[PDB]
């Protein structure tokens, strides 16, 4: 659910590409973390600060796993 | 079950919002407390209905912050 939540919020924020959303959903843990950090940076750059915060927390969760 | 889990997820979002609008927690603390407790709930009841509902309640929570 964590991956799907990150992919959904990065989609809504437009912080990642279709290929990157797919790699978040069905890639490796490391690339999922990497792409979520990219989505955090991209969403904050686009003014989606709350979504950046949400996605940052979920990536912390992916690390904790 | 699915329906009881969804009830708990919605009630958790309302509890988190009430703490936030009372001033007891800030925005990022609200996100974290919801993410942590709702992840408990989703892993305990992992049906697709519950995963979808939790992501939607996260989106409503983030919109209302």
mmCIF file with all atom_site columns, C-alpha atoms in Angstrom:
data_model
loop_
_atom_site.group_PDB
_atom_site.id
_atom_site.type_symbol
_atom_site.label_atom_id
_atom_site.label_alt_id
_atom_site.label_comp_id
_atom_site.label_asym_id
_atom_site.label_entity_id
_atom_site.label_seq_id
_atom_site.pdbx_PDB_ins_code
_atom_site.Cartn_x
_atom_site.Cartn_y
_atom_site.Cartn_z
_atom_site.occupancy
_atom_site.B_iso_or_equiv
_atom_site.pdbx_formal_charge
_atom_site.auth_seq_id
_atom_site.auth_comp_id
_atom_site.auth_asym_id
_atom_site.auth_atom_id
_atom_site.pdbx_PDB_model_num
ATOM 1   C CA . UNK A 1 1  ? 0.000   0.000  0.000   1.00 0.00 ? 1  UNK A CA 1
ATOM 2   C CA . UNK A 1 2  ? 2.932   2.335  0.695   1.00 0.00 ? 2  UNK A CA 1
ATOM 3   C CA . UNK A 1 3  ? 4.176   2.096  -2.884  1.00 0.00 ? 3  UNK A CA 1
ATOM 4   C CA . UNK A 1 4  ? 0.685   2.578  -4.248  1.00 0.00 ? 4  UNK A CA 1
ATOM 5   C CA . UNK A 1 5  ? 0.130   5.574  -1.966  1.00 0.00 ? 5  UNK A CA 1
ATOM 6   C CA . UNK A 1 6  ? 3.397   7.189  -3.126  1.00 0.00 ? 6  UNK A CA 1
ATOM 7   C CA . UNK A 1 7  ? 2.561   6.503  -6.790  1.00 0.00 ? 7  UNK A CA 1
ATOM 8   C CA . UNK A 1 8  ? -0.946  7.957  -6.397  1.00 0.00 ? 8  UNK A CA 1
ATOM 9   C CA . UNK A 1 9  ? 0.217   11.138 -4.666  1.00 0.00 ? 9  UNK A CA 1
ATOM 10  C CA . UNK A 1 10 ? 3.097   11.630 -7.105  1.00 0.00 ? 10 UNK A CA 1
ATOM 11  C CA . UNK A 1 11 ? 0.570   11.165 -9.922  1.00 0.00 ? 11 UNK A CA 1
ATOM 12  C CA . UNK A 1 12 ? -1.863  13.693 -8.465  1.00 0.00 ? 12 UNK A CA 1
ATOM 13  C CA . UNK A 1 13 ? 1.096   16.060 -7.939  1.00 0.00 ? 13 UNK A CA 1
ATOM 14  C CA . UNK A 1 14 ? 2.552   15.276 -11.365 1.00 0.00 ? 14 UNK A CA 1
ATOM 15  C CA . UNK A 1 15 ? 5.921   14.759 -9.683  1.00 0.00 ? 15 UNK A CA 1
ATOM 16  C CA . UNK A 1 16 ? 6.826   11.603 -11.637 1.00 0.00 ? 16 UNK A CA 1
ATOM 17  C CA . UNK A 1 17 ? 6.398   10.071 -15.089 1.00 0.00 ? 17 UNK A CA 1
ATOM 18  C CA . UNK A 1 18 ? 4.295   7.080  -16.096 1.00 0.00 ? 18 UNK A CA 1
ATOM 19  C CA . UNK A 1 19 ? 7.460   5.011  -16.326 1.00 0.00 ? 19 UNK A CA 1
ATOM 20  C CA . UNK A 1 20 ? 8.488   6.260  -12.908 1.00 0.00 ? 20 UNK A CA 1
ATOM 21  C CA . UNK A 1 21 ? 5.098   5.538  -11.375 1.00 0.00 ? 21 UNK A CA 1
ATOM 22  C CA . UNK A 1 22 ? 5.321   2.002  -12.720 1.00 0.00 ? 22 UNK A CA 1
ATOM 23  C CA . UNK A 1 23 ? 8.836   1.635  -11.301 1.00 0.00 ? 23 UNK A CA 1
ATOM 24  C CA . UNK A 1 24 ? 7.548   2.893  -7.935  1.00 0.00 ? 24 UNK A CA 1
ATOM 25  C CA . UNK A 1 25 ? 4.781   0.298  -8.001  1.00 0.00 ? 25 UNK A CA 1
ATOM 26  C CA . UNK A 1 26 ? 6.660   -2.737 -9.309  1.00 0.00 ? 26 UNK A CA 1
ATOM 27  C CA . UNK A 1 27 ? 10.371  -1.938 -9.029  1.00 0.00 ? 27 UNK A CA 1
ATOM 28  C CA . UNK A 1 28 ? 12.924  -2.641 -6.337  1.00 0.00 ? 28 UNK A CA 1
ATOM 29  C CA . UNK A 1 29 ? 12.883  -1.136 -2.859  1.00 0.00 ? 29 UNK A CA 1
ATOM 30  C CA . UNK A 1 30 ? 15.886  1.089  -3.642  1.00 0.00 ? 30 UNK A CA 1
ATOM 31  C CA . UNK A 1 31 ? 14.407  2.515  -6.845  1.00 0.00 ? 31 UNK A CA 1
ATOM 32  C CA . UNK A 1 32 ? 11.085  3.022  -5.094  1.00 0.00 ? 32 UNK A CA 1
ATOM 33  C CA . UNK A 1 33 ? 12.870  5.085  -2.407  1.00 0.00 ? 33 UNK A CA 1
ATOM 34  C CA . UNK A 1 34 ? 14.866  6.993  -5.030  1.00 0.00 ? 34 UNK A CA 1
ATOM 35  C CA . UNK A 1 35 ? 11.814  7.843  -7.129  1.00 0.00 ? 35 UNK A CA 1
ATOM 36  C CA . UNK A 1 36 ? 9.854   8.899  -4.049  1.00 0.00 ? 36 UNK A CA 1
ATOM 37  C CA . UNK A 1 37 ? 12.650  11.275 -3.050  1.00 0.00 ? 37 UNK A CA 1
ATOM 38  C CA . UNK A 1 38 ? 12.591  12.626 -6.609  1.00 0.00 ? 38 UNK A CA 1
ATOM 39  C CA . UNK A 1 39 ? 8.799   13.056 -6.390  1.00 0.00 ? 39 UNK A CA 1
ATOM 40  C CA . UNK A 1 40 ? 9.233   14.901 -3.085  1.00 0.00 ? 40 UNK A CA 1
ATOM 41  C CA . UNK A 1 41 ? 11.713  17.297 -4.671  1.00 0.00 ? 41 UNK A CA 1
ATOM 42  C CA . UNK A 1 42 ? 9.586   17.705 -7.814  1.00 0.00 ? 42 UNK A CA 1
ATOM 43  C CA . UNK A 1 43 ? 6.356   18.332 -5.948  1.00 0.00 ? 43 UNK A CA 1
ATOM 44  C CA . UNK A 1 44 ? 7.953   20.915 -3.671  1.00 0.00 ? 44 UNK A CA 1
ATOM 45  C CA . UNK A 1 45 ? 9.372   22.572 -6.793  1.00 0.00 ? 45 UNK A CA 1
ATOM 46  C CA . UNK A 1 46 ? 5.831   22.730 -8.244  1.00 0.00 ? 46 UNK A CA 1
ATOM 47  C CA . UNK A 1 47 ? 4.277   24.229 -5.100  1.00 0.00 ? 47 UNK A CA 1
ATOM 48  C CA . UNK A 1 48 ? 2.620   20.994 -3.904  1.00 0.00 ? 48 UNK A CA 1
ATOM 49  C CA . UNK A 1 49 ? 4.191   21.349 -0.472  1.00 0.00 ? 49 UNK A CA 1
ATOM 50  C CA . UNK A 1 50 ? 1.620   19.316 1.473   1.00 0.00 ? 50 UNK A CA 1
ATOM 51  C CA . UNK A 1 51 ? 1.892   16.478 -1.049  1.00 0.00 ? 51 UNK A CA 1
ATOM 52  C CA . UNK A 1 52 ? 5.664   16.689 -0.810  1.00 0.00 ? 52 UNK A CA 1
ATOM 53  C CA . UNK A 1 53 ? 5.330   16.295 2.955   1.00 0.00 ? 53 UNK A CA 1
ATOM 54  C CA . UNK A 1 54 ? 2.972   13.343 2.647   1.00 0.00 ? 54 UNK A CA 1
ATOM 55  C CA . UNK A 1 55 ? 5.233   11.569 0.130   1.00 0.00 ? 55 UNK A CA 1
ATOM 56  C CA . UNK A 1 56 ? 8.307   12.267 2.257   1.00 0.00 ? 56 UNK A CA 1
ATOM 57  C CA . UNK A 1 57 ? 6.693   10.486 5.212   1.00 0.00 ? 57 UNK A CA 1
ATOM 58  C CA . UNK A 1 58 ? 5.766   7.451  3.077   1.00 0.00 ? 58 UNK A CA 1
ATOM 59  C CA . UNK A 1 59 ? 9.363   7.169  1.782   1.00 0.00 ? 59 UNK A CA 1
ATOM 60  C CA . UNK A 1 60 ? 10.577  7.277  5.373   1.00 0.00 ? 60 UNK A CA 1
ATOM 61  C CA . UNK A 1 61 ? 8.229   4.327  5.880   1.00 0.00 ? 61 UNK A CA 1
ATOM 62  C CA . UNK A 1 62 ? 9.721   2.481  2.895   1.00 0.00 ? 62 UNK A CA 1
ATOM 63  C CA . UNK A 1 63 ? 13.170  2.968  4.438   1.00 0.00 ? 63 UNK A CA 1
ATOM 64  C CA . UNK A 1 64 ? 11.954  1.711  7.823   1.00 0.00 ? 64 UNK A CA 1
ATOM 65  C CA . UNK A 1 65 ? 10.834  -1.538 6.176   1.00 0.00 ? 65 UNK A CA 1
ATOM 66  C CA . UNK B 2 1  ? -13.678 -6.621 8.331   1.00 0.00 ? 1  UNK B CA 1
ATOM 67  C CA . UNK B 2 2  ? -13.498 -4.239 5.421   1.00 0.00 ? 2  UNK B CA 1
ATOM 68  C CA . UNK B 2 3  ? -16.325 -2.010 6.671   1.00 0.00 ? 3  UNK B CA 1
ATOM 69  C CA . UNK B 2 4  ? -15.139 -1.834 10.283  1.00 0.00 ? 4  UNK B CA 1
ATOM 70  C CA . UNK B 2 5  ? -11.581 -1.089 9.094   1.00 0.00 ? 5  UNK B CA 1
ATOM 71  C CA . UNK B 2 6  ? -12.868 1.744  6.923   1.00 0.00 ? 6  UNK B CA 1
ATOM 72  C CA . UNK B 2 7  ? -14.844 3.142  9.855   1.00 0.00 ? 7  UNK B CA 1
ATOM 73  C CA . UNK B 2 8  ? -11.659 3.116  11.968  1.00 0.00 ? 8  UNK B CA 1
ATOM 74  C CA . UNK B 2 9  ? -9.618  4.788  9.205   1.00 0.00 ? 9  UNK B CA 1
ATOM 75  C CA . UNK B 2 10 ? -12.185 7.607  8.837   1.00 0.00 ? 10 UNK B CA 1
ATOM 76  C CA . UNK B 2 11 ? -12.469 8.074  12.598  1.00 0.00 ? 11 UNK B CA 1
ATOM 77  C CA . UNK B 2 12 ? -8.656  8.219  12.812  1.00 0.00 ? 12 UNK B CA 1
ATOM 78  C CA . UNK B 2 13 ? -8.532  10.940 10.157  1.00 0.00 ? 13 UNK B CA 1
ATOM 79  C CA . UNK B 2 14 ? -11.135 12.936 12.116  1.00 0.00 ? 14 UNK B CA 1
ATOM 80  C CA . UNK B 2 15 ? -9.184  12.512 15.375  1.00 0.00 ? 15 UNK B CA 1
ATOM 81  C CA . UNK B 2 16 ? -5.974  13.668 13.702  1.00 0.00 ? 16 UNK B CA 1
ATOM 82  C CA . UNK B 2 17 ? -7.740  16.691 12.181  1.00 0.00 ? 17 UNK B CA 1
ATOM 83  C CA . UNK B 2 18 ? -9.257  17.612 15.533  1.00 0.00 ? 18 UNK B CA 1
ATOM 84  C CA . UNK B 2 19 ? -5.851  17.600 17.215  1.00 0.00 ? 19 UNK B CA 1
ATOM 85  C CA . UNK B 2 20 ? -4.472  19.690 14.347  1.00 0.00 ? 20 UNK B CA 1
ATOM 86  C CA . UNK B 2 21 ? -7.252  22.303 14.388  1.00 0.00 ? 21 UNK B CA 1
ATOM 87  C CA . UNK B 2 22 ? -6.968  22.527 18.186  1.00 0.00 ? 22 UNK B CA 1
ATOM 88  C CA . UNK B 2 23 ? -3.261  23.360 17.824  1.00 0.00 ? 23 UNK B CA 1
ATOM 89  C CA . UNK B 2 24 ? -1.912  20.260 19.545  1.00 0.00 ? 24 UNK B CA 1
ATOM 90  C CA . UNK B 2 25 ? 0.066   19.082 16.483  1.00 0.00 ? 25 UNK B CA 1
ATOM 91  C CA . UNK B 2 26 ? 1.481   20.678 13.395  1.00 0.00 ? 26 UNK B CA 1
ATOM 92  C CA . UNK B 2 27 ? 0.914   19.712 9.780   1.00 0.00 ? 27 UNK B CA 1
ATOM 93  C CA . UNK B 2 28 ? 3.769   17.201 9.430   1.00 0.00 ? 28 UNK B CA 1
ATOM 94  C CA . UNK B 2 29 ? 2.956   15.611 12.794  1.00 0.00 ? 29 UNK B CA 1
ATOM 95  C CA . UNK B 2 30 ? -0.634  15.173 11.625  1.00 0.00 ? 30 UNK B CA 1
ATOM 96  C CA . UNK B 2 31 ? 0.510   13.439 8.434   1.00 0.00 ? 31 UNK B CA 1
ATOM 97  C CA . UNK B 2 32 ? 2.835   11.169 10.409  1.00 0.00 ? 32 UNK B CA 1
ATOM 98  C CA . UNK B 2 33 ? 0.326   10.168 13.046  1.00 0.00 ? 33 UNK B CA 1
ATOM 99  C CA . UNK B 2 34 ? -2.281  9.318  10.345  1.00 0.00 ? 34 UNK B CA 1
ATOM 100 C CA . UNK B 2 35 ? 0.226   7.425  8.200   1.00 0.00 ? 35 UNK B CA 1
ATOM 101 C CA . UNK B 2 36 ? 1.470   5.344  11.124  1.00 0.00 ? 36 UNK B CA 1
ATOM 102 C CA . UNK B 2 37 ? -1.929  4.363  12.551  1.00 0.00 ? 37 UNK B CA 1
ATOM 103 C CA . UNK B 2 38 ? -3.631  3.852  9.217   1.00 0.00 ? 38 UNK B CA 1
ATOM 104 C CA . UNK B 2 39 ? -0.753  1.607  8.095   1.00 0.00 ? 39 UNK B CA 1
ATOM 105 C CA . UNK B 2 40 ? -1.433  -0.525 11.140  1.00 0.00 ? 40 UNK B CA 1
ATOM 106 C CA . UNK B 2 41 ? -5.083  -0.721 10.037  1.00 0.00 ? 41 UNK B CA 1
ATOM 107 C CA . UNK B 2 42 ? -4.384  -1.471 6.367   1.00 0.00 ? 42 UNK B CA 1
ATOM 108 C CA . UNK B 2 43 ? -1.870  -4.282 7.071   1.00 0.00 ? 43 UNK B CA 1
ATOM 109 C CA . UNK B 2 44 ? -4.277  -5.844 9.553   1.00 0.00 ? 44 UNK B CA 1
ATOM 110 C CA . UNK B 2 45 ? -7.134  -5.665 6.947   1.00 0.00 ? 45 UNK B CA 1
ATOM 111 C CA . UNK B 2 46 ? -5.325  -5.703 3.601   1.00 0.00 ? 46 UNK B CA 1
ATOM 112 C CA . UNK B 2 47 ? -8.268  -5.912 1.240   1.00 0.00 ? 47 UNK B CA 1
ATOM 113 C CA . UNK B 2 48 ? -8.162  -3.681 -1.828  1.00 0.00 ? 48 UNK B CA 1
ATOM 114 C CA . UNK B 2 49 ? -11.245 -1.815 -0.534  1.00 0.00 ? 49 UNK B CA 1
ATOM 115 C CA . UNK B 2 50 ? -9.324  -0.854 2.629   1.00 0.00 ? 50 UNK B CA 1
ATOM 116 C CA . UNK B 2 51 ? -6.155  0.162  0.735   1.00 0.00 ? 51 UNK B CA 1
ATOM 117 C CA . UNK B 2 52 ? -8.157  2.366  -1.635  1.00 0.00 ? 52 UNK B CA 1
ATOM 118 C CA . UNK B 2 53 ? -10.155 3.912  1.202   1.00 0.00 ? 53 UNK B CA 1
ATOM 119 C CA . UNK B 2 54 ? -7.014  4.711  3.210   1.00 0.00 ? 54 UNK B CA 1
ATOM 120 C CA . UNK B 2 55 ? -5.352  6.394  0.236   1.00 0.00 ? 55 UNK B CA 1
ATOM 121 C CA . UNK B 2 56 ? -8.527  8.424  -0.333  1.00 0.00 ? 56 UNK B CA 1
ATOM 122 C CA . UNK B 2 57 ? -8.723  9.427  3.326   1.00 0.00 ? 57 UNK B CA 1
ATOM 123 C CA . UNK B 2 58 ? -5.047  10.435 3.134   1.00 0.00 ? 58 UNK B CA 1
ATOM 124 C CA . UNK B 2 59 ? -5.886  12.642 0.141   1.00 0.00 ? 59 UNK B CA 1
ATOM 125 C CA . UNK B 2 60 ? -8.792  14.250 2.009   1.00 0.00 ? 60 UNK B CA 1
ATOM 126 C CA . UNK B 2 61 ? -6.586  14.737 5.082   1.00 0.00 ? 61 UNK B CA 1
ATOM 127 C CA . UNK B 2 62 ? -3.848  16.419 3.048   1.00 0.00 ? 62 UNK B CA 1
ATOM 128 C CA . UNK B 2 63 ? -6.380  18.677 1.282   1.00 0.00 ? 63 UNK B CA 1
ATOM 129 C CA . UNK B 2 64 ? -7.818  19.808 4.572   1.00 0.00 ? 64 UNK B CA 1
ATOM 130 C CA . UNK B 2 65 ? -4.466  20.647 6.233   1.00 0.00 ? 65 UNK B CA 1
#
